Amino acid sequence: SQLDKDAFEVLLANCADEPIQFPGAIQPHGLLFTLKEPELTILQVSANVQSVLGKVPDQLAGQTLDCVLGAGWAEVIRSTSANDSLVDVPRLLMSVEGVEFEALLHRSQEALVLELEIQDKAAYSERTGNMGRMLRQLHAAADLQTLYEVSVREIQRMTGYDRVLIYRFEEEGHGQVIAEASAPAMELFNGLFFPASDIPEQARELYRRNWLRIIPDANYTPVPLVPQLRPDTQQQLDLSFSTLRSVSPIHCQYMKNMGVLSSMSVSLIQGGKLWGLISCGHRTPLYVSHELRSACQAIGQVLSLQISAMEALEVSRQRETKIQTLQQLHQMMATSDTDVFDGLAQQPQLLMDLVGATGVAIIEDRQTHCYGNCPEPSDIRALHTWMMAGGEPVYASHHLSSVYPPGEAYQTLASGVLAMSLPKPVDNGVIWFRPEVKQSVQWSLRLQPRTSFEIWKVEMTGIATKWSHGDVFAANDLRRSALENDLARQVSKEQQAVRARDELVAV
Amino acid sequence: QLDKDAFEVLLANCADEPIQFPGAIQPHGLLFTLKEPELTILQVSANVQSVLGKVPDQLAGQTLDCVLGAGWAEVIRSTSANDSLVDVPRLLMSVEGVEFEALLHRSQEALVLELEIQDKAYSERTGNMGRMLRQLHAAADLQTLYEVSVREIQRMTGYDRVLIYRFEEEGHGQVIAEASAPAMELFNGLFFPASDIPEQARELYRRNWLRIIPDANYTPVPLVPQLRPDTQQQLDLSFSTLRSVSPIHCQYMKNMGVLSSMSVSLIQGGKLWGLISCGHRTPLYVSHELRSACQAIGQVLSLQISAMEALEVSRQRETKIQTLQQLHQMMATVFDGLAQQPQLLMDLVGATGVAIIEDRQTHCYGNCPEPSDIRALHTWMMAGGEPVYASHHLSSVYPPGEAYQTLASGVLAMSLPKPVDNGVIWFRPEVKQSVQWSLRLQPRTSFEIWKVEMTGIATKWSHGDVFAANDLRRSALENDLARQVSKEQQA
């Protein structure tokens, strides 16, 4: 209908600052209660109480829990809440009015948030053996990529979900799918990149503050919270930590377009930062039991530490190689005995791997020796003069188009440069080149992954992979090695001062 | 007196004990050596005559169904379908009115099977693992991680004492964390020599995750026959849960006051980082579920230690650069300027005394030797000519270095290639200074033996520690070599 689309257009237009932390509604697979701290006085209740527990929500507000959940259950819950910090609380599978309810408790804004999750009747030794199997398989991962596919495949084996993907968030937000174990007759999303605008900052904060996000129904009607605002606090309700939180209609539409209806994502956090996400998707809606989502919560913590451990080892492994090859070039520089830059020119292949690049252009006056994928010599000549205007010793930039506007015709080859030139008056230098990230990636309406990929393409124009701290350190230290050898040649020019006394002696 | 003569023989020769080939298995189980074709019994445990009521001499050389059962032999053959016996689940069995747990592995082309006996007399287990993972995730400092891990393991398995040992650079073991029941001798901070854990034991713990000894006062059961007919050489038990421990370690545990032990190996980068050793005063057996619970902890905890340490390696090395560039900036403004701020020099590499030796005078800062003998120390290193000299055992190669071993046992000095003898020397203290603790195989003797074996050895200079010294000399070299060109500019 025309009325329905009008609200969607406003919501879709303004999605970066949509207050998803205060949805004002919850998913229909649970009941939400706000309880006052001293006497468990009900502040606001989800309108689902009419459907289950058979109580009109108008007069339910302001009364004790005993009025709806019974005296004994309310006493048990009050005893559990007081002086417990609501951390690692054992599951309380209560049963009121013939409906099984799993009770999850937390607190926010000096109030108690109580979630009663309905357990389907149709829906431990086996689970324990599975956890050990997963721990063994994850520990056996020799490489990071092997860890990715092993983890994705075995999560699919555990949960039976029709798709499991792992997104890794790069430096500027953009996420990339790095592993996938999908059910037959489904799309292949491996290698796809999506823009950082696809996930808002509020969503990133919510994923960092939680571990599991479960959306059992994409085609779900949001049950509102009556009253919308808290009576005592005179404000909205904070549902950041609430499992029963309304998802934005934009994301529901996006999930429907992809073909998924039930989703479950496990956050991956390293050092207080969101490394990525483990997205599990299904076609037929399904509800994940407490045992299943307690196991997958433990999966994320194991993976987050394991990924962090291998990331540091890879950093150390490459850094040791950087210092190993840095000494090798220094030895080549000293024993070259031909020119300051000739020794580097003798091994162009080794020069690239020192920093990580695709082409180098070692320059000595009027001779622009270029190796690997590189622009035409005139542009390399042109690019050199721009950096000497600044006078900086080492200049690293992964976005040449936005700092050097004429560096656009060759942005497909030289999108990030790293140049080191000794301060001697004559021209000099070694310039490294990196390609656009968009060239490496190869992947097969709106609110679809196909549209997301194109938006990433138009935003990643002229951006190369960032120069790592080791890469800049490698260039900076090579400058010291070149400078140390350059001043040695200045010592060798004392032979001129040796002959100066010789032709003065004859006089 | 017969045991005393035999026991003392083994004590002298401990580094060559064939612990991988004991020939005996612990009484809490029966081990059968099986052949793939039709499940022929190669070797059978001695206690099969008691628990199973079959003659060990007669039971050798027939089908496993005779002692186990036709259906049980069938299911064993089914699960052991040449599938590497890695992902085998639990196969609870009941033969002759007793309950068994089946373990399978393959050594020297076999199908060796272990039947573990459990005592006749869930949601919390999954919740315990979740709480354990959450608690380690919440930890930030390494010491906090050790404390919380030890406390959590002690709560989970119920053992009276739990300790974490870490193996240092040389090989000696140091107890880092400990959480124990009251009225027992604390062992935190104690150091024991590498001789307590032989190389064979180190390799076996490297190739295993869990090593359990339920009863210390046990009589090993003899494997019969003692030679495999297909190899005529003792059965390889290096991957077997049921394995008789060396009596030296039995005596060690008895003297230390523990009768049940359960050690979880900690492996990082394929190397034995340490051990999580649990001990109980009363013989306490374990269940199948608890074996996997503590096994997973060692895998999880070893992952954090590798990650937490590597974060500290980077953090320490970044702080060096901030200190390194500070000196380089101070260098430009040939050695006198450095004497203004000597404090950051020690923090640059980790030290306690720094000596500046250029031209004639010498400056003594921090805990440093006497200037007279310091000058003698500088004279040696110039003969070698190395740009940097790294050594942690000065008395090992510098015999006069005995009068100031406590003051300085390890040195890291750099000198300039220019002819005039000028350089800077750093010092480290002995390790024994910072370690304090309260044939008599006791922890106290091991600390006494360690103190003897740790004389004159200081903390090893890390790769980053030497790298800072190599970089600092380049800062002095650049200024000196710049003035070398200035010497040309003079004329």
Ligand SMILES: *C/C=C1/C(=C/c2[nH]c(/C=C3[NH+]=C(/C=C4/NC(=O)C(C=C)=C4C)C(C)=C\3CCC(=O)O)c(CCC(=O)O)c2C)NC(=O)[C@H]1C
């Ligand atoms: C400006 C608003 C928009 C928006 C909002 C939004 N997105 C999410 C969650 C997403 N969206 C993802 C986008 C994708 N990009 C891809 O390439 C694919 C599939 C291959 C997807 C699905 C994405 C990965 C997530 C995280 C999901 C997860 O696994 O956790 C949210 C959060 C909603 C919530 O309640 O958590 C919001 C608000 N989406 C848009 O497309 C733009 C218009």
Ligand SMILES: *C/C=C1/C(=C/c2[nH]c(/C=C3[NH+]=C(/C=C4/NC(=O)C(C=C)=C4C)C(C)=C\3CCC(=O)O)c(CCC(=O)O)c2C)NC(=O)[C@H]1C
């Ligand atoms: C020269 C050989 C000897 C020997 C053999 C031996 N020891 C072990 C196992 C040990 N021993 C440990 C020693 C300790 N040092 C201490 O300071 C403390 C306590 C404060 C102890 C217990 C030690 C920690 C282990 C590992 C225990 C574990 O369960 O992993 C073995 C291995 C036995 C095996 O079956 O694997 C051997 C062969 N011990 C000696 O003391 C000397 C004489």
